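Thread: sanity check for a docking pose with oxalate ion

Original post by kr_44:
Hi all, I'm comparing my docking run against an independent structure prediction. Below are the sequence and the ligand SMILES. Could someone generate the full complex and paste the structure tokens? I mainly care about where the ligand ends up relative to the chain.
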Amino acid sequence: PQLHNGLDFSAKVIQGSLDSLPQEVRKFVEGNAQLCQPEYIHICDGSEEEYGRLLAHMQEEGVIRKLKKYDNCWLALTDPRDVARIESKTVIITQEQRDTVPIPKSGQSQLGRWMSEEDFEKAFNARFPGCMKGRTMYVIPFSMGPLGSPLAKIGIELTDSPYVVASMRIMTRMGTSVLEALGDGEFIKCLHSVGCPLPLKKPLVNNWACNPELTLIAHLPDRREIISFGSGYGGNSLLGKKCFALRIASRLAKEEGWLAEHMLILGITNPEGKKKYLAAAFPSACGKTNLAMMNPTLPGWKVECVGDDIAWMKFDAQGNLRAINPENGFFGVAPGTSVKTNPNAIKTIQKNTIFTNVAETSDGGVYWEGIDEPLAPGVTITSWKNKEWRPQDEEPCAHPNSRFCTPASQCPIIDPAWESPEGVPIEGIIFGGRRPAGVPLVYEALSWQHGVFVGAAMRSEATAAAEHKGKVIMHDPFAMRPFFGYNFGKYLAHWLSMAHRPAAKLPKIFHVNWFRKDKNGKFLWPGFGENSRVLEWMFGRIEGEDSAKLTPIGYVPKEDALNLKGLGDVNVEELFGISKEFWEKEVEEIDKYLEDQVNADLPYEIERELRALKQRISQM
Ligand SMILES: Nc1nc2c(ncn2[C@@H]2O[C@H](COP(=O)(O)OP(=O)(O)OP(=O)(O)O)[C@@H](O)[C@H]2O)c(=O)[nH]1
Ligand SMILES: O=C([O-])C(=O)[O-]
Ligand SMILES: [Mn+2]
Ligand SMILES: [Mn+2]
Ligand SMILES: [Mn+2]
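Reply from moderator J.T.:
Ran it for you. Here is the predicted complex with oxalate ion included:
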């Protein structure tokens, strides 16, 4: 079939067989092997022996260190320029711009970045030709969702970073059994490269191979392709997480009729024996992981964790909205995680966990800000910059966006239906962000349409998960601003259309704010385990208890409707204070934002809720 045997990469396969691969799978592997020119090709099988050889390889290349204090835990320190997502270098390629972002009325679109095919080709040809020279191309066959389940989606990631392969083994379900489940079916084509072909022209910081100047994460939904270059951080390199399960999945969900959302899933049980499932959409670094793994302070309540970041939801035949966690592990923020805030997280990360950019103690342990554990005398701390660190400096010992990567099956409170292919019925949906003033502790939407408007009007302070600085209050509708896969105006219409389905059991919609501050600059709510008190009120509202009070913004708890026993000193007057002067400015910013950003793709019912809220506020 060839004249010079120049396209047969069989002699370069150090594990696996190209003959064992399906037709379309082999075409994808050999095609990019010819483009990127790798030295070897490694077809992953997901085995324990393979994981052990990846760790030994990375340990011999100085990429990771062994944390001798714990059981099979490893530390990785990256280049300081490659620490988080780059929303400014994340682009979506479609034929028409309106398929990706609503055409703005004045400024530029904040709902995503669009790039034409012609411009992307020039960028692609300036990066990937010969980028894997001297490196190994790993072929990762992974599954998002329960393997063999009809709702699961299979992808193939090609990467030249064993750090990516190890993390993908934790965060997804990968191995040979996924290749057997695929057969001749469709799959998502994922291609990733660090952008440092050997020999190295640039010296690497902390042995972290990266090309920051040429970083680009592109999505082509019409071709089911994800192409990422330059970065190694999880949000940019683990292509099955944000790039696949959110951006690409959101467009597919619009086509097929389901939902891909940036939400946790938890089940909560009351002292009476009843259990309900909720989902909460908070922006990045705004409390999802701490809520899904919460240890309640109310006796008789139990919280079990289904997922903490991504949910795939769909109405079933009976009218129930059912949700599954497509992920296989947790990729959580490290700073702030202590025994008092998230004790269930501490139990989980003690084994088989890969840390990134946290500090290391001299006895082989981890350390970060807010760990709230004193160290024994003589224990020294090495910061994430691989330097000696003292508690009386300015640089923090761990990076503000440092992460841990741990398997979900090790969580002590993991829900016994987190791998069920049928999903869990969602009875409530929670929105919320970081609002230091004005927004009360909790309130409930008036209807399905008002609730969609509440999610569309979400605002929060900027966090360390992106490149935003200044703690400026930005819009983050549905906590999906960095992850929209298609036109946000059509996104809003897709949510509103669920109220038309026959026998639809629409969940209630709440809005919370754990981050309201007083005049002094400190928080008014302890949060963390005490958030169970707010969840108790939600549980009763779903059961139909008459414990709400009508306000111009929604239903708030009545007086003495929240269990505050054990606190008492809480200033309830400021936790639920509704200032007319605050909400008159808030509706103006929402009006100017929606008019400019959504423009002619704004559904009428969203405009009707904006008008109704403005009227209810003017009557105060
Ligand atoms: N004051 C207060 N802070 C909280 C609370 N819950 C979480 N936090 C802090 O918020 C930070 C973000 O917590 P996470 O739950 O890990 O962030 P996330 O929402 O999962 O963000 P992503 O994982 O990037 O999607 C943590 O470092 C916590 O210290 C809370 O209830 N009250
Ligand atoms: O890392 C994450 O999960 C994020 O950015 O939300
Ligand atoms: Mn997230
Ligand atoms: Mn999280
Ligand atoms: Mn309608």
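Residues 154 and 182 are 7 Å apart (CA to CA). Hope that helps with the comparison, let us know if your pose agrees.
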